[PDB]
Amino acid sequence: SVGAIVSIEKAEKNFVITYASGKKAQISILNDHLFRYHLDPTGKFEEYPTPNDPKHVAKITAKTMADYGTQAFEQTNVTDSGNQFILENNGLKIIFEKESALMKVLDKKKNQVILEETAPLSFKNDKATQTLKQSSQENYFGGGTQNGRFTHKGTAIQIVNTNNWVDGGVASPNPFYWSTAGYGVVRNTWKPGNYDFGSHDPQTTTTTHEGTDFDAFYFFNDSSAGILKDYYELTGKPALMPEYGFYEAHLNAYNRDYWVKVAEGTAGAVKFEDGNFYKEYQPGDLGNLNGTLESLNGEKENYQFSARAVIDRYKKNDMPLGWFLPNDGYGAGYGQTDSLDGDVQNLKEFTDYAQANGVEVGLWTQSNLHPADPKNPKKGERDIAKEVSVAGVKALKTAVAWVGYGYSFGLNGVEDAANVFVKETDGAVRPMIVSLDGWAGTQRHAGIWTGDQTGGQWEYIRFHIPTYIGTSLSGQPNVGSDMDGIFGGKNKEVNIRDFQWKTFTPVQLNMDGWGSNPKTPFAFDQEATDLNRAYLKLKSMMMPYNYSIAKESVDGLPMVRAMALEFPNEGTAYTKDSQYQYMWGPNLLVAPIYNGNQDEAGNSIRDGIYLPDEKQVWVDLFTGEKYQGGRVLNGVKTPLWKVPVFVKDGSIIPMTNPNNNPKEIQRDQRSFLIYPNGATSFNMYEDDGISTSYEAGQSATTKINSQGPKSNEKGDLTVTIEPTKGSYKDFVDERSTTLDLLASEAPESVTAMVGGTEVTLKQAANKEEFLAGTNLYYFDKEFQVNQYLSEASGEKLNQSALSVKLAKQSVTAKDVQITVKGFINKGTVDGGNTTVDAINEEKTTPSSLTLQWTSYEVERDGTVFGNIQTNTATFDGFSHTFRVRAVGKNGVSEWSEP
Ligand SMILES: CC(=O)N[C@H]1[C@@H](Oc2ccc([N+](=O)[O-])cc2)O[C@H](CO)[C@H](O)[C@@H]1O
């Protein structure tokens, strides 16, 4: 312990705290809610922590202390207030008890103590530990990719480069956590740590990092978006993926292995287009067998075994494919020549072919990306500069084999790679890097994938959902994983369920070559293939929405959102009651199927669907079925074709034509799927999709406003598309406009103003007239959000919509105002009417209680459960008070005895 504080002095650039031990700390005030506290036993007070190697020059911070300016520091006063020293600016009171040295921070806007040390910093055992008060309602997020976990109260998390990709490991640590009390802390260290959020003593949180230094950035903010924006201003805004990065990729090696003709039914046999069965061999496993060597371009009497042939199969199977890594395999390489330049020419010809097919090429790496002598490369070296400038590579994946050391290593590597992409293309290619073993800052260059796990089993989904959520809460919105795992497979239902929910996630990797079957969306039967295509096409149609929430995640909430981000006033949104669902942007609640529980009809039984907000209607995206929030639904029947996705009524979802890659998007069209519910709004972002020019303001935004009746009510609806602001290379100014307004009745009238001039709309007599014509509207009871899913599910999945089409117009010069009179979107709402119209001892397990007494509701520890279809209900996931009420046609009853 450094002892009592004897003095706090305002120096030229920071406040100097002198402890009775003679140890000093510097407080740097960066803005009115962010400060750095640096207790440096060495007295050097260097701006940056020591990395694990001096060549690791990429910094945690993206903004220097000097870049924040001196204003907040100038406007912070130190006062000697008897038993305390106080630092005070417009934002914070930082209060230090003189005798104990304990720091506490009053947020002056809240007039509440947000952070309070309860024991002094401890430097024992070559670690630096802070001990904080933990309050009963205080929750904690962050830590990076905390495999299986997102909400950390009552647990400890390891801030360690664990190189463990399965539940309970850490695929990508981050020394960043935040408290729902309204603070975030970045430990300014490259050293591993352990954050114990009151795992045995619930009133104490301890944060420990190895080392002899205590250096931390403390930021105070009253919103989760503000905490993340603080983290991003400090450590770097997330990179915005190029549009193609949101599309599934195919990853494997096509330069190294051999295919041997085998019998059908041979272990590992794969059928090819010649109608024969082949089994894949590494060259060293061939033994006396003879096979056909793979190549990227299939130029060697081997076309069906080539990387080109895989592009052709995704095309033949009409599957989206954004990008392709053809060298993803240990020692695989990307050419078979005697030179790097010969291999780069082979890869360039692959990239020409991939690009002719609308697919970008990335490379995997297990190594440094530069030759020992770039002017004289050796065969088998890497030269990301030539790979980029000569071969046209646009993306990079960093194997643990490269970045496995962790901490400063990965950040240095991905920073250097990002700079090469940009420099070699003069900014024509923005970075597209997928990494792991990250740290604070990684997000500004790279997204993460979660590493190697076994698919073909429900645990593959179950642990991934919270993993994504917690990754995103850690300031990494660009998260992905392998589609149905790198290992295993042979479980059709898991495969379909994985493609389903990852539609509503950023990055999808078909990590092929290691599994129980090929890793593609067409590896299973036609039922699975058509479902996977349907969900992949839905993602392609959602690209304007997805790109818009991606833009938001550059300086705001991430794309995968913990329930608490969108519903901060509900306790359920913070706990493991929210571990298996999330908001995909603001507008979609995704509650993936994550276990094999079923009925005899093969329907999955989904428990614990938490629908927030007693005042909010949630709309099944596929069927239009409506559900009242403020409840957790158990026993929800979910057919194989379906993933539980609910639209937040009010949602504007920008859409586009189904497409297999960004070059197939019609840039001369725009389309909005709207669920009007009072006054809502959406900001649609666009840019050139590929370059760094967005960072220099080459982008455009379009504000869409929907102003109509509340859910299920009738009224006037005004949809206003404000003029598009901004421009960029190959910006298309002249676009047609579609609105698909979910509606339950034909309107009284639909009128259209374009830049203040009326456009006469005709009522289409039928769908074919509507589809053929422009300046029309059409009330359609056969509206399909996803025709591929309708066809794949064997369900029509018809919904009712009022669709409106306007002719091409200048989107910059002229707005759109559509007025619908007699607008209504009414359906029956499950739990819509909350109007007031024993413990079964023999069934008590260790962790499940069964209560007995058109449906019922039960309150479990202050959380309301619904969809209880019979005369009993069991509650589990226990290591409790039960009230029950009846549900009928005309409302409910009041709470029975606790
Ligand atoms: C975490 C990581 O880098 N994963 C890579 C890596 O994966 C494996 C997979 C299996 C083993 N093993 O059986 O011991 C080791 C490493 O390299 C793969 C190369 O194809 C993939 O890139 C995978 O994502």
mmCIF file of C-alpha atoms in Angstrom, residues 654-898:
data_model
loop_
_atom_site.group_PDB
_atom_site.id
_atom_site.type_symbol
_atom_site.label_atom_id
_atom_site.label_comp_id
_atom_site.label_asym_id
_atom_site.label_seq_id
_atom_site.Cartn_x
_atom_site.Cartn_y
_atom_site.Cartn_z
ATOM 1 C CA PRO A 654 -33.969 -0.411 -45.144
ATOM 2 C CA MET A 655 -33.816 -3.326 -47.600
ATOM 3 C CA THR A 656 -32.490 -4.127 -51.060
ATOM 4 C CA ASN A 657 -32.942 -6.807 -53.704
ATOM 5 C CA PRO A 658 -31.606 -10.250 -52.789
ATOM 6 C CA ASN A 659 -28.061 -10.413 -53.992
ATOM 7 C CA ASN A 660 -25.057 -12.713 -53.756
ATOM 8 C CA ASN A 661 -22.526 -9.895 -53.348
ATOM 9 C CA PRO A 662 -22.503 -6.086 -53.181
ATOM 10 C CA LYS A 663 -22.069 -5.644 -56.993
ATOM 11 C CA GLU A 664 -25.515 -7.279 -57.482
ATOM 12 C CA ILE A 665 -27.235 -4.604 -55.327
ATOM 13 C CA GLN A 666 -29.342 -2.219 -57.446
ATOM 14 C CA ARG A 667 -27.915 1.207 -56.447
ATOM 15 C CA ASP A 668 -30.698 2.960 -58.414
ATOM 16 C CA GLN A 669 -33.365 1.601 -55.986
ATOM 17 C CA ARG A 670 -34.103 2.053 -52.293
ATOM 18 C CA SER A 671 -36.658 0.146 -50.261
ATOM 19 C CA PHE A 672 -37.974 0.415 -46.669
ATOM 20 C CA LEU A 673 -39.826 -2.282 -44.681
ATOM 21 C CA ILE A 674 -41.729 -0.272 -42.074
ATOM 22 C CA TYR A 675 -43.776 -1.377 -39.012
ATOM 23 C CA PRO A 676 -45.314 1.985 -38.146
ATOM 24 C CA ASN A 677 -45.885 2.551 -34.407
ATOM 25 C CA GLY A 678 -46.038 6.215 -33.385
ATOM 26 C CA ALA A 679 -43.083 8.354 -34.424
ATOM 27 C CA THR A 680 -39.926 6.471 -35.302
ATOM 28 C CA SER A 681 -36.899 7.186 -37.465
ATOM 29 C CA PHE A 682 -33.919 5.545 -39.133
ATOM 30 C CA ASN A 683 -30.725 6.930 -40.579
ATOM 31 C CA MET A 684 -29.677 4.899 -43.630
ATOM 32 C CA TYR A 685 -25.942 5.078 -44.238
ATOM 33 C CA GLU A 686 -24.169 4.383 -47.517
ATOM 34 C CA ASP A 687 -20.753 4.901 -49.052
ATOM 35 C CA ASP A 688 -18.632 3.434 -51.861
ATOM 36 C CA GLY A 689 -18.596 0.169 -49.849
ATOM 37 C CA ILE A 690 -14.895 -0.465 -50.315
ATOM 38 C CA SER A 691 -12.498 2.475 -49.840
ATOM 39 C CA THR A 692 -11.254 4.578 -46.922
ATOM 40 C CA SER A 693 -12.985 7.653 -48.392
ATOM 41 C CA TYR A 694 -15.789 7.330 -45.762
ATOM 42 C CA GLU A 695 -13.195 8.538 -43.202
ATOM 43 C CA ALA A 696 -12.810 11.737 -45.309
ATOM 44 C CA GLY A 697 -16.594 12.362 -45.357
ATOM 45 C CA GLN A 698 -17.334 10.526 -48.673
ATOM 46 C CA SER A 699 -20.579 8.877 -47.571
ATOM 47 C CA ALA A 700 -24.248 9.716 -47.642
ATOM 48 C CA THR A 701 -27.070 9.466 -45.145
ATOM 49 C CA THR A 702 -30.802 9.409 -45.686
ATOM 50 C CA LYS A 703 -33.150 10.132 -42.750
ATOM 51 C CA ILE A 704 -36.447 8.187 -42.884
ATOM 52 C CA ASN A 705 -39.268 9.206 -40.543
ATOM 53 C CA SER A 706 -42.400 7.141 -39.909
ATOM 54 C CA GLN A 707 -45.073 9.113 -38.039
ATOM 55 C CA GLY A 708 -48.230 7.099 -37.575
ATOM 56 C CA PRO A 709 -50.598 5.563 -35.077
ATOM 57 C CA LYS A 710 -49.345 3.400 -32.204
ATOM 58 C CA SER A 711 -49.336 -0.392 -32.583
ATOM 59 C CA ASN A 712 -52.701 -1.815 -33.712
ATOM 60 C CA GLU A 713 -54.323 1.695 -33.842
ATOM 61 C CA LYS A 714 -55.739 3.522 -36.870
ATOM 62 C CA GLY A 715 -54.587 6.978 -37.951
ATOM 63 C CA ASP A 716 -52.664 9.046 -40.490
ATOM 64 C CA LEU A 717 -49.212 7.766 -41.405
ATOM 65 C CA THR A 718 -46.622 10.146 -42.869
ATOM 66 C CA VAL A 719 -43.403 8.531 -44.147
ATOM 67 C CA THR A 720 -40.800 11.265 -44.929
ATOM 68 C CA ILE A 721 -37.506 10.457 -46.673
ATOM 69 C CA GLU A 722 -35.313 13.561 -46.243
ATOM 70 C CA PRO A 723 -32.943 14.470 -49.118
ATOM 71 C CA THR A 724 -29.815 12.298 -49.110
ATOM 72 C CA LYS A 725 -26.875 14.267 -47.671
ATOM 73 C CA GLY A 726 -23.366 13.595 -48.946
ATOM 74 C CA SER A 727 -21.667 12.043 -51.947
ATOM 75 C CA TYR A 728 -18.976 9.523 -52.801
ATOM 76 C CA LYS A 729 -17.408 7.818 -55.829
ATOM 77 C CA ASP A 730 -20.062 6.414 -58.209
ATOM 78 C CA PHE A 731 -22.860 7.724 -55.917
ATOM 79 C CA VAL A 732 -26.171 7.100 -57.710
ATOM 80 C CA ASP A 733 -28.372 10.176 -57.377
ATOM 81 C CA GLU A 734 -31.323 8.867 -59.468
ATOM 82 C CA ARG A 735 -33.223 6.157 -57.564
ATOM 83 C CA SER A 736 -36.689 4.642 -57.463
ATOM 84 C CA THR A 737 -38.266 4.247 -53.975
ATOM 85 C CA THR A 738 -40.335 1.373 -52.491
ATOM 86 C CA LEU A 739 -42.099 1.403 -49.131
ATOM 87 C CA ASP A 740 -43.499 -1.868 -47.732
ATOM 88 C CA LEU A 741 -45.685 -0.722 -44.841
ATOM 89 C CA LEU A 742 -47.022 -3.610 -42.732
ATOM 90 C CA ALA A 743 -50.759 -2.902 -42.677
ATOM 91 C CA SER A 744 -53.889 -4.904 -41.875
ATOM 92 C CA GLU A 745 -56.366 -2.978 -44.138
ATOM 93 C CA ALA A 746 -56.334 -1.042 -47.416
ATOM 94 C CA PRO A 747 -55.831 2.658 -46.676
ATOM 95 C CA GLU A 748 -58.355 5.463 -47.256
ATOM 96 C CA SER A 749 -55.794 7.246 -49.495
ATOM 97 C CA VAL A 750 -52.114 7.371 -50.391
ATOM 98 C CA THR A 751 -50.604 10.686 -51.604
ATOM 99 C CA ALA A 752 -46.992 11.394 -52.552
ATOM 100 C CA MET A 753 -45.034 14.644 -52.593
ATOM 101 C CA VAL A 754 -41.579 14.562 -54.255
ATOM 102 C CA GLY A 755 -39.483 17.684 -53.475
ATOM 103 C CA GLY A 756 -42.704 19.607 -52.678
ATOM 104 C CA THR A 757 -44.443 18.625 -56.003
ATOM 105 C CA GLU A 758 -47.391 16.166 -55.910
ATOM 106 C CA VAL A 759 -46.855 12.832 -57.730
ATOM 107 C CA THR A 760 -50.166 11.153 -58.609
ATOM 108 C CA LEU A 761 -50.234 7.542 -57.331
ATOM 109 C CA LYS A 762 -52.509 4.914 -58.984
ATOM 110 C CA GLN A 763 -53.877 1.971 -56.930
ATOM 111 C CA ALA A 764 -52.469 -1.228 -58.545
ATOM 112 C CA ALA A 765 -55.353 -3.665 -59.300
ATOM 113 C CA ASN A 766 -53.089 -6.694 -58.616
ATOM 114 C CA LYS A 767 -49.484 -7.600 -57.667
ATOM 115 C CA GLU A 768 -48.316 -7.992 -61.345
ATOM 116 C CA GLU A 769 -49.458 -4.430 -62.231
ATOM 117 C CA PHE A 770 -47.759 -3.151 -59.020
ATOM 118 C CA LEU A 771 -44.491 -4.994 -59.847
ATOM 119 C CA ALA A 772 -44.576 -3.782 -63.530
ATOM 120 C CA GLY A 773 -45.426 -0.114 -62.826
ATOM 121 C CA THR A 774 -44.261 2.983 -60.875
ATOM 122 C CA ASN A 775 -46.022 5.802 -58.921
ATOM 123 C CA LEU A 776 -48.432 3.107 -57.593
ATOM 124 C CA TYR A 777 -49.538 1.696 -54.262
ATOM 125 C CA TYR A 778 -50.885 -1.775 -53.546
ATOM 126 C CA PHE A 779 -52.467 -3.349 -50.431
ATOM 127 C CA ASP A 780 -51.124 -6.930 -50.542
ATOM 128 C CA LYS A 781 -52.226 -9.847 -48.265
ATOM 129 C CA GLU A 782 -49.639 -12.087 -49.998
ATOM 130 C CA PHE A 783 -46.592 -9.972 -49.017
ATOM 131 C CA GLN A 784 -43.603 -12.216 -48.394
ATOM 132 C CA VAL A 785 -40.679 -10.697 -46.468
ATOM 133 C CA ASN A 786 -38.579 -13.611 -47.784
ATOM 134 C CA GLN A 787 -39.872 -15.631 -50.766
ATOM 135 C CA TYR A 788 -36.865 -17.996 -50.447
ATOM 136 C CA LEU A 789 -38.001 -18.838 -46.858
ATOM 137 C CA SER A 790 -41.616 -19.234 -47.937
ATOM 138 C CA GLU A 791 -40.469 -21.715 -50.592
ATOM 139 C CA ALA A 792 -37.924 -23.432 -48.248
ATOM 140 C CA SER A 793 -40.366 -23.722 -45.245
ATOM 141 C CA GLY A 794 -43.298 -24.948 -47.390
ATOM 142 C CA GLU A 795 -45.281 -22.184 -45.567
ATOM 143 C CA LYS A 796 -46.628 -19.211 -47.565
ATOM 144 C CA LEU A 797 -45.614 -16.889 -44.675
ATOM 145 C CA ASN A 798 -47.933 -14.287 -46.189
ATOM 146 C CA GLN A 799 -48.252 -10.960 -44.432
ATOM 147 C CA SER A 800 -50.396 -7.926 -45.207
ATOM 148 C CA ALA A 801 -48.579 -4.819 -46.432
ATOM 149 C CA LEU A 802 -49.374 -1.511 -48.108
ATOM 150 C CA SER A 803 -46.572 -1.147 -50.669
ATOM 151 C CA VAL A 804 -45.791 2.149 -52.467
ATOM 152 C CA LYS A 805 -43.473 2.654 -55.478
ATOM 153 C CA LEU A 806 -42.167 6.051 -56.735
ATOM 154 C CA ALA A 807 -40.393 6.631 -60.076
ATOM 155 C CA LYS A 808 -36.684 7.494 -60.267
ATOM 156 C CA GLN A 809 -35.891 10.882 -58.710
ATOM 157 C CA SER A 810 -32.831 12.790 -57.539
ATOM 158 C CA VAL A 811 -32.464 11.569 -53.910
ATOM 159 C CA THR A 812 -30.219 14.626 -53.173
ATOM 160 C CA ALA A 813 -32.433 17.307 -54.790
ATOM 161 C CA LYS A 814 -35.922 15.994 -53.818
ATOM 162 C CA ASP A 815 -37.398 14.479 -50.622
ATOM 163 C CA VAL A 816 -40.307 11.976 -50.453
ATOM 164 C CA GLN A 817 -43.402 12.508 -48.299
ATOM 165 C CA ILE A 818 -45.995 9.689 -48.438
ATOM 166 C CA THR A 819 -49.233 10.299 -46.531
ATOM 167 C CA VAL A 820 -51.520 7.327 -45.800
ATOM 168 C CA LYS A 821 -54.991 8.162 -44.478
ATOM 169 C CA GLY A 822 -56.719 5.338 -42.540
ATOM 170 C CA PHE A 823 -53.420 3.587 -41.875
ATOM 171 C CA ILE A 824 -53.777 0.567 -39.541
ATOM 172 C CA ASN A 825 -51.604 -2.452 -38.760
ATOM 173 C CA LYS A 826 -53.793 -4.379 -36.286
ATOM 174 C CA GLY A 827 -53.447 -7.991 -35.150
ATOM 175 C CA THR A 828 -54.258 -9.944 -31.996
ATOM 176 C CA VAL A 829 -51.458 -9.483 -29.469
ATOM 177 C CA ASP A 830 -50.438 -12.423 -27.288
ATOM 178 C CA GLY A 831 -50.549 -10.973 -23.728
ATOM 179 C CA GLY A 832 -51.932 -7.723 -25.237
ATOM 180 C CA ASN A 833 -54.688 -7.413 -22.571
ATOM 181 C CA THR A 834 -53.255 -7.287 -18.970
ATOM 182 C CA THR A 835 -56.742 -6.019 -17.772
ATOM 183 C CA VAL A 836 -58.126 -7.923 -14.681
ATOM 184 C CA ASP A 837 -61.161 -9.913 -16.061
ATOM 185 C CA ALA A 838 -48.344 -25.373 -4.405
ATOM 186 C CA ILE A 839 -44.681 -26.398 -4.908
ATOM 187 C CA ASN A 840 -45.080 -29.995 -6.258
ATOM 188 C CA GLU A 841 -42.585 -31.536 -3.723
ATOM 189 C CA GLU A 842 -42.285 -34.783 -5.803
ATOM 190 C CA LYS A 843 -40.987 -32.842 -8.912
ATOM 191 C CA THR A 844 -38.345 -30.661 -7.045
ATOM 192 C CA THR A 845 -34.923 -31.448 -8.656
ATOM 193 C CA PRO A 846 -31.612 -29.849 -7.593
ATOM 194 C CA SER A 847 -32.163 -26.511 -9.516
ATOM 195 C CA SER A 848 -35.791 -26.894 -10.818
ATOM 196 C CA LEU A 849 -39.036 -26.111 -8.934
ATOM 197 C CA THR A 850 -42.448 -27.098 -10.418
ATOM 198 C CA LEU A 851 -45.497 -25.011 -9.416
ATOM 199 C CA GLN A 852 -49.085 -26.436 -9.701
ATOM 200 C CA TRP A 853 -52.588 -24.873 -9.208
ATOM 201 C CA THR A 854 -56.244 -20.217 -22.635
ATOM 202 C CA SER A 855 -52.939 -19.833 -20.579
ATOM 203 C CA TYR A 856 -51.305 -18.762 -17.209
ATOM 204 C CA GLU A 857 -48.485 -16.396 -16.007
ATOM 205 C CA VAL A 858 -45.980 -16.900 -13.061
ATOM 206 C CA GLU A 859 -43.605 -14.269 -11.462
ATOM 207 C CA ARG A 860 -40.194 -15.926 -10.650
ATOM 208 C CA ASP A 861 -37.906 -13.678 -8.468
ATOM 209 C CA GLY A 862 -39.620 -10.517 -9.911
ATOM 210 C CA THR A 863 -39.571 -11.740 -13.602
ATOM 211 C CA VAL A 864 -43.019 -12.499 -15.212
ATOM 212 C CA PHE A 865 -43.278 -15.785 -17.253
ATOM 213 C CA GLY A 866 -46.028 -16.392 -19.885
ATOM 214 C CA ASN A 867 -47.151 -18.936 -22.584
ATOM 215 C CA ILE A 868 -47.845 -21.503 -19.770
ATOM 216 C CA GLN A 869 -50.384 -23.577 -21.807
ATOM 217 C CA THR A 870 -51.301 -26.196 -19.108
ATOM 218 C CA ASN A 871 -52.046 -26.437 -15.344
ATOM 219 C CA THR A 872 -48.427 -26.394 -13.989
ATOM 220 C CA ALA A 873 -45.040 -24.701 -14.714
ATOM 221 C CA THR A 874 -41.445 -25.690 -13.846
ATOM 222 C CA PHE A 875 -38.577 -23.131 -13.486
ATOM 223 C CA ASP A 876 -34.902 -24.118 -13.688
ATOM 224 C CA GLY A 877 -31.422 -22.674 -14.386
ATOM 225 C CA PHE A 878 -31.332 -22.325 -10.538
ATOM 226 C CA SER A 879 -28.064 -22.963 -8.566
ATOM 227 C CA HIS A 880 -37.573 -18.274 -4.889
ATOM 228 C CA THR A 881 -41.102 -16.704 -4.649
ATOM 229 C CA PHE A 882 -43.844 -17.803 -7.129
ATOM 230 C CA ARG A 883 -47.060 -15.823 -7.777
ATOM 231 C CA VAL A 884 -49.558 -17.145 -10.422
ATOM 232 C CA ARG A 885 -52.430 -15.477 -12.403
ATOM 233 C CA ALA A 886 -54.856 -16.857 -15.108
ATOM 234 C CA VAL A 887 -54.914 -15.646 -18.816
ATOM 235 C CA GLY A 888 -58.107 -15.809 -20.985
ATOM 236 C CA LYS A 889 -59.932 -14.011 -23.863
ATOM 237 C CA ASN A 890 -60.723 -10.785 -21.865
ATOM 238 C CA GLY A 891 -57.505 -10.306 -19.779
ATOM 239 C CA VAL A 892 -55.927 -11.849 -16.602
ATOM 240 C CA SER A 893 -56.411 -12.143 -12.759
ATOM 241 C CA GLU A 894 -54.412 -10.335 -9.962
ATOM 242 C CA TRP A 895 -51.291 -11.862 -8.212
ATOM 243 C CA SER A 896 -52.118 -14.926 -6.001
ATOM 244 C CA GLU A 897 -50.404 -15.284 -2.546
ATOM 245 C CA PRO A 898 -46.562 -15.295 -2.773
#
